[PDB]
């Protein structure tokens, strides 16, 4: 209604007198860390709890109907899970029954030791492209071909299928055990904050990258055809270039078997998202279209008459644990570290979305946790790294899930199909399993969609999508991220180092006060010039406020005073023989600052010791206590700079400046 | 006096009524370059007289007076610039002739690009340091040794004095070229805030760092050692222990003659500076030193008696210009980089210092260009880059200096001393030389004790500082300088991402708001919760504001309903059969923030939608303009989120409420 106030002008020293501060807490290390570590039973149940979610949700089960909607989501997730294992195997260079291994054993660590309800812990297609790709910078083809067979001319340098694939598994486990490794260090030291870097936009354009490379490499895989291992700068380029010179060396059985499953998925996949309201429950197309495929397939002698490529290579058993061979860290260490910091990037994001729809909570380093354990129970069972796949999580959250026991039977079906099914799916084209791939990279496609909105929104988000999209398609995809958080930290940079300063003005007959270049109607006070500085002055931004000073007051305080001693020395010589006009003080609104950062307290002292010379008061506004303490510390407060410089709001200045040009003329 | 006001409340749309904004300016891309480049001799006039300063200082000159002080100083400078030319040159691998060259043609051209007065263009010992780095690296000893002289067992492979030096020299004018070519891309780009990286603590701890290498590097020369040119990583730290273990092969004639100069030019030098009162002109102890030490060494045959080391390889002459060998950009690029920014950076540092005092403005963006073809000009006559060192500055402005004649003065001594001087410093000592060196150390060695003083005040610019001084010794020292920039640039980041949040509370009887962990008699509205957030909210510090949110209401908005919903279905079934109680609204004082990085302005509308699920209003106090402005773009306001809930004070958020309540119970 009425906003009315009646206080004197109280600017630093007239209120910092009668306020009686609160003492700060004595440091007091030793019954800080004594106070930290309790003893009571209580946190040790408290952190016992939290390490093992697992004794929350089973004691207040509701078997009734929760058995039946988990026995269901477990079937169906199941097969969903040894079809995607089955199909991200290819990924990750490795063979098929180890992807297989890696949709098993993750599943069973993360039930233990995971946080969430509606996860399905599995491969991934841009975590298995990266493990993929990094396998094939490390162990590439062209390091394995041995000379046999009683070649033509030269020695037989024929294929080295075989001993081939143990390489590619144990460097494949051993990159499972550092991305563990990592993922237990990150979790343990209670440091969460390092993923908060990867911005919408980061994760946006690297998902768009990952899903362009996935496109390339399942085309390759489809088409047949046998590229040079293009790896580095430009490798995606480069091996499309290769594909597109190598298209008469392709398989016509293969491409239009490909092209036919990935439009029958295509289309069904759309008629069900569109559809929705008549069927809830996803028809698996996945299970039915690889069934079929696999049918056909053993029909006609796909491999012998039409030369197909079939996988024909399912041992269908176990085998025991290998232990990782250690010593390949320091050459694949950031590797790990990219692949560790999107594989929990991606989990967080599925375990926020599906929880925030479910309404419940999800812990962060537990979940860091779970993974981390998960990975490295991974590393000893000859598996790649695990994460959750969108579309594979989607089923057990459509067809009815609760607890993780639906996730503990989706791993019954990839159990049975490890030791006894399996047979059946040897004649199966591998240009089929790339099919669902590419069908699933539909929702990563159309991300693009969003960067015309984020440039109607703030540009400076919309840039780093282009960025990350483009660099993380030049210099490899691991090494994209990286190159995409430096460029937003060098973007928050330059957002805290070139501010939004402005002119501010007073509006008649009140106390609010506007920015100039906005309001018209706004007058200024007679010789008072008032301005405000956003984006805390740092070391960076310091010739920025010199320069904004500068134009805010119209003239400079070093050339000023440079004429006046110019001037007067042609008036200590008259005796012998014989600009700052408008601008009576500057009032720095400087309300939006945090730190100071005392190169910066150095400077602000230079410029109020300038403008001193030339008889023109700097005046604050809206410095906040937690800057002004900081300021007396870094030595700003001498015997000619006190308190009453500063004031405590923007009209109180200007209310000080008017009285005093009245009382004293 | 009295601050009185009386004024509605107006929130946000009480406001933007009955005030007309102003129009913002057009575009117009078709004039906005046309308007630019202007057609007025008034603009070519402008260009020509910034590009070439010297056609300011020239035609105003004081010839009466100002000729008769250059004439005294360019020959005190001149005596200390062939000295100190010379002697850093041995800190860059090439021979002693080089090393004057490096001290005329730069100065040749730093006199018609030059914007400065009190700079005398020359070597530098940090960074000939880095310019000799990358010779050691690129060119080592070990790759020259050619196997001649019969020796005798295996071939002879001693040391290949001569034609040596030609892959040194030629590899110094190609590093010289790239430094004068990114100096003059920063210059012609017009982009100089790249410099202001650069804190006081981060090339304080570097320039103190490199004191270190320069220490070891020339305490080498003293002992006349010969090391294994160890290069990056642990560079400094391995060549100082091969040192250690080479005491045994030293040369008492070089040590005893070499510490006696290195306590003779402290002495003076420590007692000129203190007892200032009584000299004014400063002794030119470094001068002085060197004519003595040429005459005892040529007296006593010290190359042949005491097996001392001298130069003995001055041939005196000039050389024709030679074109630098294009190619050695791409294995140099890197390194060029640190060197170039050095190089202006203690350019600006030292110029301003001198500047100051004198009371005449040095251009910026005309020091890339003055020291960009000065560099250049100085590739095509074999140089390294060309600085300015403090100590030689100090010279030329002490004894009195006024414009850059006393410069070209200071070129026509070390002119004469290659054509006609230079034979007489023959027997000079190599000692000698790097003893003059290692005296002026002592000014970037004292740098160490503002670590203490850094540390009471702001204790993150402290640590830059202890980490570009270690980072710097560890791996190389350019790399050290790119660790310490990225350093510094994630410490603004992590200052702006963890921000120092508040508890505000209203001061009895006023309007103004101060922290509640600060000061004790506050009294806060009844349900109201006041909260501030600086730092302005981003990508990385969304996941904070929601945890500083929960923390100063008690609860959390997420929690609370979740367990409104598992109370409510009791409520439904019991029909069939038969927390939030302080926390009323929420004032977000965000008049600290700059800008709004979308990725997290969305989680704003989620928080107002979270808390209004359990009746709790989430309103806004200082808002800015061009902030509010960025929420409509962003997609904020919606049919049920009005500008009614943003407010243009603190206090008329709270004016606000007590009207609600009493107006609606
Ligand atoms: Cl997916
Ligand atoms: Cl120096």
Redesign the interface.
């Given at each position: 209604?009425?906003?009315?106030?009646?206080?004197?002008?109280?600017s630093e020293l007239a209120?910092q007198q009668q306020?009686?501060?609160?003492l700060p807490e004595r440091r007091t290390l030793r019954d800080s860390l004594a106070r930290s570590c309790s003893c009571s039973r209580k946190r040790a149940f408290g952190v016992v709890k939290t390490l093992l979610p697992i004794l929350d949700w089973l004691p207040k089960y509701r078997v009734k109907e929760w058995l039946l909607s988990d026995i269901i989501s477990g079937v169906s997730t199941g097969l969903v899970g040894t079809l995607q294992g089955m199909a991200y195997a290819l990924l990750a260079a490795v063979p098929v029954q180890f992807g297989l291994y890696s949709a098993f054993f993750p599943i069973l660590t993360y039930f233990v030791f995971g946080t969430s309800r509606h996860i399905s812990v599995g491969p991934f297609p841009v975590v298995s492209l990266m493990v993929g790709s990094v396998v094939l910078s490390m162990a590439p083809d062209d390091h394995f071909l041995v000379p046999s067979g009683n070649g033509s001319a030269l020695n037989s340098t024929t294929l080295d299928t075989g001993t081939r694939d143990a390489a590619r598994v144990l460097l494949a486990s051993t990159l499972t055990l550092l991305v563990g490794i990592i993922q237990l260090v990150f979790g343990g030291l209670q440091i969460g904050?390092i993923v908060?870097?990867l911005?919408?936009?980061?994760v946006g354009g690297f998902t768009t990258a990952a899903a362009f490379q996935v496109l390339v490499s399942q085309l390759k895989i489809v088409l047949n055809v046998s590229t040079k291992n293009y790896n580095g700068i430009l490798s995606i380029i480069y091996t499309l270039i290769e594909i597109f010179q190598n298209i008469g060396d392709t398989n016509i059985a293969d491409f239009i078997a490909g092209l036919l499953t990935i439009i029958v998925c295509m289309a069904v996949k759309e008629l069900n998202d569109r559809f929705k309201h008549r069927i809830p429950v996803p028809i698996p197309i996945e299970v039915i279209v690889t069934i079929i495929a696999t049918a056909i397939s053993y029909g006609a002698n796909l491999e012998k008459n039409y030369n197909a490529g079939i996988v024909k290579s399912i041992p269908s058993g176990f085998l025991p644990p290998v232990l990782p061979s250690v010593g390949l860290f320091s050459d694949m260490l950031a590797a790990s570290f990219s692949i560790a910091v999107v594989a929990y990037a991606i989990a967080v994001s599925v375990g926020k979305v599906y929880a925030?729809k479910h309404?419940?909570?999800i812990d962060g380093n537990q979940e860091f946790i779970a993974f981390g354990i998960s990975n490295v129970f991974s590393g000893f069972f000859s598996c790649f790294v695990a994460t959750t796949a969108l579309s594979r999580t989607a089923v057990q959250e459509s067809t009815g899930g609760k607890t993780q026991v639906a996730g503990l039977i989706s791993a019954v079906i990839v159990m049975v199909a490890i030791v006894a099914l399996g047979r059946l799916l040897e004649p199966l084209q591998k240009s089929v399993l790339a099919a669902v791939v590419i069908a699933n990279l539909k929702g990563m496609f159309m991300q693009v969609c969003d960067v015309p909105r984020?440039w109607?929104?703030?540009k400076?988000?919309a840039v780093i999508w282009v960025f990350t999209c483009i660099m993380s398609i030049i210099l490899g995809l691991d090494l994209g991220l990286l190159a995409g958080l430096?460029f937003?930290?060098?973007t928050?940079?330059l957002?805290?180092?070139f501010?939004?300063w402005?002119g501010l003005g007073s509006?008649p007959?009140?106390?609010?006060y506007?920015?100039i270049?906005?309001?018209?109607?706004l007058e200024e006070p007679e010789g008072v010039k008032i301005l405000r500085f956003?984006?805390?002055i740092?070391?960076?931004?310091?010739?920025?406020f010199k320069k904004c000073i500068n134009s805010t007051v119209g003239f400079?305080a070093?050339?000023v005073?440079?004429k006046r001693?110019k001037a007067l020395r042609r008036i200590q010589k008259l005796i012998k023989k014989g600009p700052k006009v408008p601008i009576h003080s500057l009032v720095l609104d400087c309300?939006?600052?945090?730190?100071?950062?005392?190169?910066g307290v150095?400077s602000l002292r230079m410029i109020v010791k300038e403008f001193q010379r030339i008889d023109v008061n700097v005046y604050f506004a809206?410095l906040?206590?937690?800057v002004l303490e900081?300021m007396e510390?870094?030595?700003f407060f001498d015997d000619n700079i006190r308190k009453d410089r500063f004031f405590?709001?923007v009209?109180?200045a200007i209310?000080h400046l008017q009285?005093q040009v009245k009382s004293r003329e």
């Open positions: 209604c009425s906003y009315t106030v009646s206080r004197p002008v109280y209120f306020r009686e501060r609160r904050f908060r870097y911005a919408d936009p980061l925030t309404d419940y909570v984020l109607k929104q703030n400076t988000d430096l937003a930290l060098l928050v940079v957002r805290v180092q501010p939004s402005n509006v007959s009140t106390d609010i506007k920015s270049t906005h309001y018209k109607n956003s984006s805390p740092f070391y960076g931004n310091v010739d920025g400079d070093i050339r005073y440079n001693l309300g939006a600052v945090s730190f100071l950062d005392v190169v150095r809206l906040q206590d937690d900081k510390q870094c030595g405590l709001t009209h109180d209310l009285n």
